[model samples]
Target: AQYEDGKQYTTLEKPVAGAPQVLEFFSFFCPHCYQFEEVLHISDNVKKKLPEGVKMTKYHVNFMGGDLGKDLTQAWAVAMALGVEDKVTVPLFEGVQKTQTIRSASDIRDVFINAGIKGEEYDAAWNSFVVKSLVAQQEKAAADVQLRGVPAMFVNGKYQLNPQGMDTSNMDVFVQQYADTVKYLSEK
Candidate 1:
């Protein structure tokens, strides 16, 4: 149960009550975040090895997408509401970065449409109380953390993963160390 402060992880001033919680703060506009998801599949990989009862929540950032930030974040919430992060992230990334096709909220709706989520279903979650609440929480978290970069992670809403403190030379070793970090930090 031993961990380092400001090294492998950093403790929050007031830890959130969501014990065994994992918050992944990322942005679609970040290249490294894209690589972290589409290429390395960090979230999916970590989920595979995570202990039971551990809930990892991926929160899209509202600071990086420019004018489209809120809309994109809402769309991501819709994906979460429908259980489709795996299906939605890559297409959305491509739309915003690679292809430069996502111009508006409606354009984002099209990305969701191609992800097999119906437009109406997207709208329902778009305006749903739950999704809006999630979005608000995400925005608050971004403010609380004051993130300088994307692909940041916090365990139990307190212990933040410090990539610089871990081995990052290889993907396999990196992921192993990451999973180990989560398993170790879940209790504190």
Candidate 2:
């Protein structure tokens, strides 16, 4: 199974162990993606229940806001720097979605701080090559994937979630059922 190396917040190698990867494309300002956060975080049941080897990663969709791409690039870098990509994932999503605050990279940094990650640690992570090169890789992947909107899920680089796969209204059912569907696809 293939995964988009670019565009996604974090990077994972293809075939991702025994599991087909789940890469969700999102935006901080997008409301739909915000709604899905509850499923990934709140239920807390879902993470444990996730299919074996089905690691979930995220990509913050850019191309809006003045110079927003720079912020997103840095965010991806910071996630790598802090070594807490998952830790900041749902919170950053919720911060902008629920509070509608933190529009830029600087703001995102504050979100990291609020989450208890030290400022210096985050700074180091963002400055390193792992994050920088990863961001460059993301740009190439985003173009290759040709993303259209937020809350889009790319399953194994084959199936993509649109309004049909995840409506965002019934997010829990969407993800849980979606997970089952991916498992079905993997078995085939």
Candidate 3:
């Protein structure tokens, strides 16, 4: 398999061991990220196409740098901690960005309640030390990657799989580049 460095993907100094890792940096507040979700159905498509020995993870970016962004980041971390991340992912996005139902912590709690998470589970996940630690950790990771925006993917913890000079408005080009990069890395 042939791929261009700094074109199809940027090379990482140290690749993740054992397998290829696809790390998606996104925020629920990002309109472009939301568009990517609707257009590519990113999570599901990536999973279906994931090669053997490849692992994918999504990190909510907090580059917006404000209380709202911080809270949303923690909220996502809490969701992952509670093991309901997959279940709540899309709904949470739509609730916040589209339906306007998830503005406050109380509103988020209601969503959890509707999802059958008892108050204790919600409280534990929301306030747990582990969740806080993870939120801080992910924030650092985003910073380490020098993330300028959401909807970016890091392959093998080294290469940022963003094709250079491409118009990000074109979803076909973006998705194809990502899919091809992952395929190449997995084979490597």
Candidate 4:
């Protein structure tokens, strides 16, 4: 829907190959991303409509440029590495937005603990050198993309799907619009 040059979306000079890559740039502290994720959950069919080999990725934006963003970003990478992203993503959002209890690294660790991740296991991943390296790589990738804000989706690494101004009140319509757009770009 609402497309703008370099504002709402951007076209990559060179798109990637293989399975179409769908990347969502977001931050836990962003209220708009919280709302977007809520809509995404309700519109669960978005991913289902995707063709096979579609690689979807969620990247945490370090827009704030501080410990808060970095810690949360690393925490998410840890969750992903532990295969607990689906389990901890919503809880992390709720813990930060609804409960307002996530204020520090310990608070984030507690969130993982509540999600059934053993403390020792979490500590291992949370402080692992591998996770640290991945965090650094992800950070560089985010910066390299030059993202303007969170809740932004990049399809095939070239097309930034514009959904910010869409009417999200109707979940089906919103989902179809986004899914269709992703599918369209992905096929190209």
Candidate 5:
């Protein structure tokens, strides 16, 4: 799994006792995930109201981990490697969503450049040993999960959370309703 807390990607591996493990599979490039952000507060609210052990983990799912995944995978890797992940992740996402012009490696670098991570730093970090490793891990995980799209989730590592699967239109409402699912599973 492309998992390592504080690395390229972080995994919410520690499961809560008697509670469903919430794994929100999303991508920074995903507009729905961006749109869902407005109402993901349901997940946020659930995290705040967790029954002692329950918690949520955010996973960044890339469509490709190979040469194709290089652009996004590298961007994320560089951000984390240089300790600017918090600053870059959201901005990078916003840049793509707003500009709707960056979907290539050069463009990805431009996003990082605009995010203030610096050009020199961008070059060094993107090609760094650590960043390469992160890309490797992301590649492995994307293949392992055979992930088809972004913003899909897995509750308790079993229940797949697909708002569209439920014939829902709003991601926020989808998450809020899933909050009810969280409550139900905690008792099981």
Candidate 6:
């Protein structure tokens, strides 16, 4: 089985509590993540092909952007709260990697304002118990994994994907391989 634990993945020391879940750890500050979502569209490709009942949860890893890391994570949660991730994520990526316009939570708040969320509402969500804990959970997931990379994924809280073990003749092939491996591990 390509689901060989050590070869294709590293099982978590402390498994997350969700079943049939895929947690994707990525950073807006990561160039590869930008390439994956914006240029290559790999994340969308993978999600479209995921097995029934499996969903990929996004966790913005906070190890890279220093002080801005937590703020970036907050932006994601805030967007989710406003039901606007579809509106918010790409712009942030473009702001950071394409135009160099975003740098702090205030800049992120400005983006939300542009998206039609009131300034005070953005602040309310930013400090809300729901959004704050969401950020904390994402950060803690990174620390628990001792993770140090962009575009990393863990299946069912345990199996972390290792791209080295996947076919890489090209990205399309790699995308299918990744979705297949995720289905296999998720079935476990």
Error of 1 at 173 (Å): 1.4
Give the least accurate 10-residue stretch of model 5, judged by summed lDDT.
Answer: 1-10
TM-score per model over all chains: 0.88, 0.71, 0.82, 0.85, 0.63, 0.87
How do the residues 116-167 of candidate 5 rate in per-residue lDDT, one tens digit apiece? 7788978988778887787675555444445688766555643444354342
Best model number under lDDT: 1
Model 2 earns a TM-score of 0.71
Error of 6 at 166 (Å): 2.7
User: How does model 1 fare in lDDT?
Assistant: 0.81
Full ranking by lDDT: 1, 6, 4, 3, 2, 5
> Model 4 off-target regions past 4 Å?
1-9, 13-20, 42-44
Higher-ranked by TM-score: 5 or 6? 6
Worst ten-residue run, lDDT, model 2? 3-12
Please name the candidate that would achieve the greatest TM-score relative to the true structure. 1
Each candidate's clash count: 0, 5, 0, 0, 0, 0
By TM-score, highest first, what's the ranking?
A: 1, 6, 4, 3, 2, 5
lDDT of candidate 3 over 1-188, digit per residue (tens): 25767667777665544322777788878887887677767666666667655567787877663666677788788887888877777777788789977767787677778877899888888899999998987777776666787778776667777545444677876666567666676555
Estimate candidate 2's alpha-carbon lDDT, on a 0 to 1 scale: 0.60
What local lDDT score does residue 65 receive in model 6, on the 0 to 100 scale?
Answer: 85
lDDT of each: 0.81, 0.60, 0.73, 0.74, 0.59, 0.79
**Least accurate 10 contiguous residues by lDDT in model 4:** 1-10
lDDT for each residue of candidate 6 in 1-188, tens digit (9 for 90 to 100)? 64787776777777766533777888899988887787667667668777655666777877778888778888887876778887888888888888988887778777878878888888888889999888887877777777888888887777888877777678778777777777677677
Candidate achieving higher lDDT, 1 or 6: 1
Error of 4 at 12 (Å): 3.2
Model 2: runs farther than 4 Å from truth? 1-20, 39-50, 163-172
39-80 per-residue lDDT for model 2 (tens digits): 444223334555565576566656644476468656866775
